[PDB]
Write a protein that binds this ligand. Structure first.
Ligand SMILES: [Fe+3]
Ligand SMILES: [Fe+3]
Ligand SMILES: [Fe+3]
Ligand SMILES: [Fe+3]
Lengths: 101, 491, 82, 303, 491, 303, 82, 101
């Protein structure tokens, strides 16, 4: 029951450590996945950010929400974990599942 | 102009070649490589999904450390040591002791892959992996070093892995099994996939939440920074697993994952479970240990496992039940035998805590609470001899931890035993016995500390001789009640 | 010297207890209780009995460990008559 | 009965204040505490047998390997500060020389010499990376392993240089086999066969002592003197002014690898028996090294 | 190889030349340069004792900011804003408001020297000086910006200097006098020597101590980092003073120092004095304001002044007496007129504080305490109309602050007035009147806010019309009792 | 009656999220609020008269100078990150070329050309530093002044390059007057007299608009095209391979100064009257600039 | 309308108080007291008097501001008879 | 009196902001000025370190007490103020007074 329900989820997305990337990434996730609901759980040291099936962060939108020049690879200074498989390049990172549970 | 990474990345991992002057098997021997007979050419399709490259790496890792050290420097005078609840300080002591030199051991699992993996992209990511674990080993010696001058048990950040202390031996049995003791592909599967994407989030992020609530940002900042490297080098495991599955090796892959998850589980239950549900002050418990398990292991990690094409492990229902029960008994064991630990366990059973425990774990008071009732009375009536043990707990032959069960109103305890090769072994679960039987040559002539005690290797053959054996050199180094029993005044 | 591992009824673990070759199960039971009752287990009335771990048969109270055929480091349960 | 100390118990009994390097680098292999089982497992598990044979039984012996000291005393933090400054310098060189269209101005045919003699270096450097990682994992002291770790990273650095420049050069010279034919050359070109035979054999020398001597005292000095420096001279004669600067940065690393190497040898020779062990491994490997150098140089200066 | 700085440093400042196509005086006009007729050749012996150079500067300043921002980022969730005493939050509000855009103004004092100083070493150090004040202006807009969304009075970090609020006008009168309004050598003497080596230590280090005690490390870390730049560019002033003294200008030098010290003093007494002795929670008062004055101004700065060959200023005994008295009356003024401030003054007169004040300032209760007794009773008896003013305080024509004195059992108050050029001016000390008389063209047609009120420029000519005049746009922006009067429950 | 905002009131009424640059750079000169007194002093204090005359009364006029935007959007933090990477690159070039004894290998007599034509550049660059600081302190918007501040620092950077290399070169060539004779050359050498006459006059153009146009639209473009680039060509012909790389780094800065300059002009020309003001100042100064270039070039390519 | 600046006995500052051309010093004194007594200054018995700031002579109580020759924005003290 | 005594001091030396330079600088000041008494006042955000007349910090000793490579110019990351005149070079910084009060 408890275990079952917790397992049948398709939540994907970044876990961001406390710091200056938390709000920009939340705002980026909202902007770049229009008509997904973004969920956010705040555990003070980190924030768990998720969407169903797929969540995209583009460099361009994250730089705009952050307010300063930003390269996609730098996200790892603050990406402490993530749910989903990850596909990452110079332009965006995508968290996604192959399967639907 | 500079050319973007996608245009030259493939050349960085075009490094496989057909050997001629030695054979392929001489160059990648199976006992170190673990390639299971899969030919070289099949490994070339390995594609690490979390890439980095050398110029980016040194630049971004430089910036990660600048922040970690700057924050530590800016907060040295915030009197964390002196103002923190002693249960929090003990959390710091067990963490640094059980982990610092285990990080440095992880360099060798990554070096194993860097040399012996037939996947070129793995060999390069393992090379950043080596660098990362070096970072983590050095951070977590540097950060506690400050504190040596306050408290000799902070010496155990360095000393633990050189000791025969029982929890250090459980740490080393586990890391030597899944990190330093097996071939490259076993490391990829057992360490980078099973341990590093599943369980370490509990200790480096779950516990960071608690540290943040406790006002200890040096530590929360540090361990969450560390986990950002993990997030990258742990992604070496999925593509190896996918390759094994595509080449006919799903069953062998599954068995390695099943084993590593359970080995990791029994170790986190004795280290992190007590920290989260007892040592961490009540008001700093972001979530219960079980809630954090359901978030990090059931909700995030088991779903990732499913997505890569593997099955839930066969013992999944044993595991769920264990999350409800096991660490409560390990905490009791660690606290009753506190004098054998290098930190100071907090009892964590004031009435207000017991209410929380009862909320987080319905039925707790009629179970573990029955034992704590006996303990708490002894303390009130100043019967301190009933609060210290005069014998050894029976220790597991797999995970090296005591054999436990549910106490109180529905007492249930089971030992799973095995005769093998003229000897009698005892395991604390069905799964532990099964792990042993997957690879007896790995374990069969290992002797746990109780084995050693009964065979004559611990002199004198007394609880005190065992204390000295475990490396303790003064009464101050051995563990004590964190609040020196002042919790009983609240009872 | 006879090392057994013993699990006491309503206790939380298994402990090493060193009993004697010639002990009655009654004495074995006292020696294990020593490390249990009033430490993590509340005293109670009744007759303490010894059985091989998880088994359904009690050893007779008078029986000795050597009479019993137990091997060293085997597991025993100490429990109260139904 | 005792009291808090200002540093680890193992560093406590020396006069000097422990440095960063001492605090974070020293005596971290617990696998050397129990000669009968390196690893906390069955004393004859496979990896325990491996270590007993290829580390503990090396004829290269010292009673305090842990006392070794990196003459550069690098830690992870200071390696990255240093290498970010050197690598940021090499990338700025890449960017500026590209802006100036450096590659179009090399002497006629130099792209063919690069495609034959330079770009397949990525195989060689990767072999040095693999081999460094092996010495890391076998060495009997963490201060020694730490130098190997950094050396492994430097080897990847050189590999990555070579990959970037192979690709970049192909953009000006798209018909020279750059980024297409290196594996073939490594496997089949006569000038690459001495090196490849050397590295394949070196990568199966599993004794930690022999691995270290053959890699750091024979192979890598040969690459400096027979591959790096002659390639700088050839670039000079062909109006390649980028390559000599790049190789000078790489030589910096090489000279660092050579410094810790000689310091380890100095530490080893405190044991008089160790001088005949080191020298015999040098005599053993030097002929493969010399053949490898000559075959490369013949390729390099051939028509 | 690289050559060490001492071998090429002199060439970096070998930049004076003899002009030919314009005259020296056209190139360095006295009204912008302030060279007092001292020829070009004499300025070449100027030797900045705290050197830096461009490669070192960008490298080390990069590392200073990395730490400042990293610490701020790691602590954003420590709930300082929500958990701090409201007196501490008001300290942050007055600090950022009174200082951020004044830092950016200091760029222009440094640019004045960079262009118009005849000393080449000064022109280069002024160029790093420009860079430093830019840094400080940007830090102290960036850091409070976070907080706009919590509290509109944090908008005043940016807005204050664009307002006619009376304390903003006192800030601007002072900085425009000593930073942006005078020739290069006056800047060197009044700003870099008198202000920057003497008084700013009170606000960027004295107050950092208090911030550290308050658990606000973001802020303590920030402002102490800032002061490390100050320590370097402030050293432009000593060598100019030494040069003036060697060329016959000691008297003019002395008069500029005397003036700048006193102008700075009356401004710190209204900003820092209340912060230190009232707003900062009692338990975070590292030292009293007067103790910090004796450490930073009497003990450190006056002794440095002596060492360079200058005299104690003529008003030194007025000054000592003022340290005992003045800020207690400025605090009372700011708190009774709190509605004209953009922060929320704390009264700071609970019995426990009054005991501290009495210890730090024997006789306080029979003086200011007499007024606070009347105020406190009104509050207890809920007579809130007696706790808000219905008129304007009389404002100074130099420093733009109200005219005050010692109240209570030995009431003493004095106004020093002056008729000049058909107008009547009022000054709050002998020294303020003397400053005016040193340079009347600088001040004579300036109109303080009360002047403006009485001449018709404030409509309506009511306390409310003056509130709107000062830029306040909602009741929430105007200052209130920090604890909204809950302190009276302790009375 | 109102409520907290997410940003400064002046940035609040725009759609986009304020950037770092916006937050810390915009509308910070309060000295432009009161036309009758810039500074909070007597309305006719000397500095108030100065600003009223040389800023407020400039014929270069715009009703929203503060709306100007650095096209690079630099703040102090990002200037230093950028310049630490470029300057760390130039210092590594200095160090490596020195290791290679670059200076001894220049063509015969090149040290004399350097001593005449290169090292006295420290006077010229210092004049650009002084002049940039003047535009900083007079400009009617903080976003404009901020570009000038950075430009002032870049000018010191170039000055410092030149000082370091003058000294270093003298170590190989100690008899060419390097580090000894530059002030004399600046004052008396005919090839330096056009430049010096240009800068002395430019440094006494006190109108903020005329200062900006004459410095950034006439003087600095002339230095790029008539001093930097021909010195690179001359170094190429004399086997000075360091100087072209150094000047390329300096040109990076120059091209940045030119970018913000053109952006300011674009902002200014929103006012149609401003096009005849800018052009007349360009016509006014261009002949001094051209004379300065020709005299320098004659020196440079003379015997 | 006649602006003076007034310092009330035992108060901490000088305040702007707008009195009238034709006020007696008695009324002037009330108007200043308004902004002082019971706000920062405790009430007391006695006859409030007006004097030019720091001076030793009181104005007569009946005297008017205009009778007095005071100029606008000059400073006055309000004090109690010895 | 109070003012007088506070003014007649010849105390010189660095004021170090909270961070990793505080103890190394104290220890350096002790080592490098043997037979001066070093005084230390700790204000938590900063530490005031002094000696009579002159206090020297050498690069070599500070690097040894700090435990990592150190250049003299870097001291300004943590030198928040100082008493005395300063004479600084690649090898040391000296805080000193010309006069004796
Ligand atoms: Fe790790
Ligand atoms: Fe890891
Ligand atoms: Fe400043
Ligand atoms: Fe300053």
């Amino acid at each position: 029951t408890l275990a079952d329900q917790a397992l049948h989820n398709n939540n994907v997305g970044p876990i961001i450590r406390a710091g200056d990337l938390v709000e920009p990434v939340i705002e980026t996730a909202e902007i770049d996945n229009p008509g997904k609901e973004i969920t956010v759980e705040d555990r003070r040291a980190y924030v768990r950010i998720a969407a169903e099936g797929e969540l995209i962060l583009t460099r361009k939108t994250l730089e705009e929400q952050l307010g300063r020049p930003f390269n996609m690879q730098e996200l790892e200074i603050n990406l402490a974990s993530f749910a989903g498989q990850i596909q990452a390049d110079e332009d965006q990172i995508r968290f996604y599942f192959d399967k639907t549970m | 102009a500079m050319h973007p990474r996608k245009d030259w990345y493939e050349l960085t991992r075009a490094t496989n070649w057909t050997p001629s002057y030695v054979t392929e098997e001489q160059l990648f021997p199976e006992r170190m490589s673990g390639h299971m007979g899969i030919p070289l050419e099949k490994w070339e399709s390995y594609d690490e999904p979390y890439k980095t490259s050398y110029p980016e790496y040194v630049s971004i890792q430089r910036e990660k450390d600048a922040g970690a050290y700057s924050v530590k420097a800016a907060l040295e005078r915030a009197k964390i040591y002196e103002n923190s609840d002693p249960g929090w300080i003990s959390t710091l002591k067990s963490h640094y002791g059980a982990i610092a030199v285990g990080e440095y051991a992880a360099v060798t699992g990554e070096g194993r892959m860097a040399r012996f993996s037939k996947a070129p992209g793995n060999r390069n990511m393992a090379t950043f992996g080596m660098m990362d674990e070096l970072r983590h080993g050095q951070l977590q010696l540097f950060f506690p070093h400050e504190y040596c001058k306050k408290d000799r048990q902070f010496d155990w950040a360095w000393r633990a892995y050189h000791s025969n202390e029982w929890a250090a031996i459980a740490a080393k049995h586990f890391f030597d099994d899944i990190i330093t003791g097996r071939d490259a592909i076993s490391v990829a599967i057992m360490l980078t996939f099973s341990f590093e994407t599943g369980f370490t989030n509990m200790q480096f992020l779950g516990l960071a939440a608690d540290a943040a609530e406790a006002g200890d940002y040096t530590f929360a900042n540090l361990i969450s920074s560390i986990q950002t490297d993990e997030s990258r080098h742990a992604q070496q495991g999925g593509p190896a697993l996918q390759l094994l599955i595509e080449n006919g090796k799903r069953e062998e892959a599954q068995k390695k994952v099943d084993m590593a998850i359970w080995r990791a589980w029994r170790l986190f239950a004795v280290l992190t479970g007590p920290v989260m549900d007892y040592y961490t002050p009540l008001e700093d418990r972001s979530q219960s240990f079980k809630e954090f398990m359901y978030e990090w292991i059931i909700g995030q990690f088991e779903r990732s496992l499913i997505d890569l094409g593997l099955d839930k492990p066969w013992y999944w229902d044993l595991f769920l039940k264990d999350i409800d029960e096991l660490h409560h008994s390990y905490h009791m064991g660690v606290w009753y035998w506190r004098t054998t630990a290098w930190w100071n366990p907090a009892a964590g059973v004031t009435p207000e805590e017991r209410d929380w425990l009862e909320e987080k774990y319905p039925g707790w008071n009629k179970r573990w609470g029955r034992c704590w009732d006996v303990i708490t009375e002894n303390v009130l009536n100043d019967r301190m001899d009933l609060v210290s043990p005069e014998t050894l707990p029976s220790v597991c032959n797999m995970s090296q931890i005591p054999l436990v069960g549910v106490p109180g109103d529905d007492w249930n305890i089971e030992v799973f035993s095995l005769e093998h090769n003229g000897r009698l072994y005892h395991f604390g679960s069905e799964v532990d016995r099964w792990v042993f039987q997957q690879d007896p040559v790995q374990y069969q002539n290992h002797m746990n500390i109780v084995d050693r005690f009964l065979a004559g290797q611990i002199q004198p053959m007394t609880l005190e001789g065992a204390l000295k054996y475990m490396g303790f050199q003064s009464i101050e180094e051995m563990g004590k009640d964190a609040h020196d029993f002042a919790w009983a005044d609240k009872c | 010297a006879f090392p057994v591992h013993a699990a006491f009824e309503k206790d939380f673990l298994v402990q090493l207890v060193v009993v004697d070759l010639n002990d009655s199960m009654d004495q074995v039971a006292e020696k294990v209780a020593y490390h249990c009752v009033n430490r993590r287990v509340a005293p109670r009335e009744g007759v303490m009995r010894v059985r091989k771990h998880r088994s359904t048969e009690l050893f007779p109270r008078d029986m000795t460990i050597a009479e019993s055929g137990l091997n060293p480091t085997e597991v025993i349960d100490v429990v109260f008559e139904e | 009965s005792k009291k808090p100390m200002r540093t680890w118990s193992h560093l406590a009994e020396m006069r000097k204040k422990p440095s960063e390097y001492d605090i974070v680098s020293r005596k971290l292999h617990y696998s050397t505490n129990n000669p009968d089982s390196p690893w906390e497992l069955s004393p004859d598990s496979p990896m325990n047998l491996w270590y007993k044979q290829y580390r503990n039984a090396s004829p290269l012996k010292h009673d305090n390997w842990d006392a070794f000291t990196d003459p550069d005393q690098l830690v992870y933090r200071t390696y990255n500060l240093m290498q970010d400054g050197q690598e940021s310098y090499v990338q700025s060189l890449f960017d500026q020389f590209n802006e100036r269209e450096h590659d179009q101005m090399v002497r006629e045919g130099w792209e063919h010499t690069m495609a034959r003699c330079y770009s397949p270096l990525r195989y060689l450097f990767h072999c040095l990376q693999m081999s460094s990682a092996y010495v890391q994992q076998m060495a009997p002291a963490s201060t020694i392993s730490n130098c190997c770790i950094l050396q492994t990273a430097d080897s990847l650095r050189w590999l990555t240089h070579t990959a970037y420049r192979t690709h970049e050069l192909s953009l000006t010279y798209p018909d020279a086999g750059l980024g297409e034919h290196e594996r073939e050359l490594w496997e089949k070109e006569p000038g690459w066969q001495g090196l490849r035979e050397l590295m394949e054999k070196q990568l199966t020398a599993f004794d930690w002592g022999e691995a270290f001597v053959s890699l750091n005292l024979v192979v890598k000095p040969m690459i400096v003197e027979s591959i790096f420096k002659p390639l700088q001279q050839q670039a000079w004669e062909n109006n390649d002014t980028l390559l000599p600067l790049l190789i000078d940065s790489q030589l910096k690393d090489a000279e660092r690898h050579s410094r810790w190497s000689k310091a380890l040898v100095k530490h080893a020779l405190e044991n008089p028996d160790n001088h005949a062990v080191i020298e015999g491994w040098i005599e053993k490997w030097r002929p493969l090294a010399d053949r490898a150098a000559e075959a490369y140089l013949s390729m390099l200066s051939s028509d």
